[PDB]
Design a protein around this ligand. Structure first.
Ligand SMILES: O=c1ccn([C@@H]2O[C@H](COP(=O)(O)OP(=O)(O)OP(=O)(O)O)[C@@H](O)[C@H]2O)c(=O)[nH]1
Ligand SMILES: [Mg+2]
Length: 382
């Protein structure tokens, strides 16, 4: 009876978090507004959505992630001081034109990603605008593709993992733990090990990353178990399947050896030191491409030269720093081998790692004792 009510409520909650019918249009108009601001700021403004609004793993409270690009934008020129400063000047104007258009709480943040955040003056949606977030654009298209296999199954599962994580401070970026995307990736890996998602074992990007095309290819061949086809018109049955995966998810990350293995949708459980060599190869490829592009920019803007090896070295150092193999968690972004879980400090390894021991205790051991509003609520701890 407790289990049956828990599953009922949990699906209820998922069903109440699905974007309303008109929401597609809202988000499209939002994009149009951002592009208007962008056009005032940069030449050949281009605005591209990513994040959960692209993947579809969103609530009506989820923010809007937008990648801004412009004429002669190049991802490889990041690190070069003159291009960096040029981008800062682009984001400065973006900020100023955003306030003028009537965006609220406009904030230009100078960071590991020069970013402009604002609250849309029309719909109240929070917006995170960054220059050339190519990795975000791509891995959001891969996630959307995954969700499409059976939206309510993956959606519900990912929703509840996210609701759980958010509500439980497992996903608390500005609070030193994981972000939505890291947690999504973890939850998706557990489905791979259950045979409920395919293993993206053969990436074919220029730098060895997984591409949208790699992902779509596999997801077209992947079939869920036959029993899954009775779950489309029965929320009690589907909820049972989702609940099963949540138990397996809670379980997995309560017992998973991160001291050896990594989380990866490309190579589940790949050893840290193998990831290390994978990163080294990736960055050797990224590094040389980068060098070629800096050298081309420099040939065309001689006063921006000569190629300053300190600058290059520090740029490469930032790429290396995005990808430690030797950190509390190694959760691999499949599009760039970024260790999107690198930010979780050794001291947090406790919180998370208990609250997983705790999710699985409620879902499995104390199954007969289940209450929706006790598993999924605020946890002021970190
Ligand atoms: O470490 C990261 C963080 C973020 N990202 C990329 O930026 C996107 C937006 O970052 P968000 O924090 O908004 O996550 P999200 O959109 O998946 O989920 P909610 O907002 O609904 O909670 C992520 O979905 C991913 O595309 C990364 O690639 N790596
Ligand atoms: Mg988002």
């Amino acid at each position: 009876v407790a289990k049956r009510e828990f599953i009922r409520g949990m699906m209820a909650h998922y069903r109440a978090s699905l974007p309303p019918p008109e929401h597609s249009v809202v988000i499209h108009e939002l994009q149009k507004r951002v592009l208007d601001i962008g056009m005032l700021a940069v030449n050949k403004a281009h605005v591209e959505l990513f994040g959960s609004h692209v993947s579809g793993f969103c609530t009506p409270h989820s923010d809007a992630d937008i990648s801004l690009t412009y004429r002669n934008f190049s991802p490889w020129l990041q690190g070069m001081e003159r291009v960096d400063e040029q981008n800062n000047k682009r984001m400065t104007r973006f900020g100023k034109e955003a306030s003028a258009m009537g965006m609220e709480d406009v904030r230009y943040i100078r960071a590991r990603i020069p970013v402009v955040q604002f609250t849309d003056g029309v719909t109240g949606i929070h917006c995170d605008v960054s220059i050339g977030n190519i990795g975000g654009v791509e891995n959001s298209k891969i996630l959307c593709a995954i969700r499409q296999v059976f939206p309510d199954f993956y959606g519900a599962y990912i929703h509840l993992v996210k609701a759980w994580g958010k509500a439980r401070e497992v996903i608390a970026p500005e609070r030193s733990t994981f972000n939505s995307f890291t947690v999504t990736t973890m939850a998706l890996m557990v489905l791979q090990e259950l045979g409920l998602l395919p293993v993206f074992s053969k990436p074919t990007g220029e730098f060895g990353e997984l591409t949208v095309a790699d992902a779509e290819m596999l997801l077209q061949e992947f079939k869920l178990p036959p029993i899954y086809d009775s779950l489309h018109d029965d929320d009690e049955k589907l909820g049972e399947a989702v609940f099963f995966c949540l138990q397996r998810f809670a379980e997995y990350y309560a017992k998973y050896d991160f001291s050896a293995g990594t989380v990866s949708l490309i190579h589940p459980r790949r050893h840290r030191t193998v990831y290390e060599r994978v990163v080294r190869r990736h960055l050797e490829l990224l590094g040389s491409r980068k060098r070629l592009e800096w050298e081309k920019h420099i040939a065309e803007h001689k006063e921006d030269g000569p190629l300053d090896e300190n600058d290059f070295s520090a740029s490469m150092q930032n790429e290396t720093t995005q990808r430690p193999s030797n950190s509390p968690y190694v959760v691999e972004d499949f599009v760039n081998y970024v260790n999107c879980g690198r930010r979780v400090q050794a001291s947090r390894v406790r919180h998370i790692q208990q609250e997983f021991n705790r999710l699985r205790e409620m879902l499995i051991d104390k199954e007969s004792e289940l209450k929706f509003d006790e598993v999924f609520r605020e946890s002021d701890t970190v």
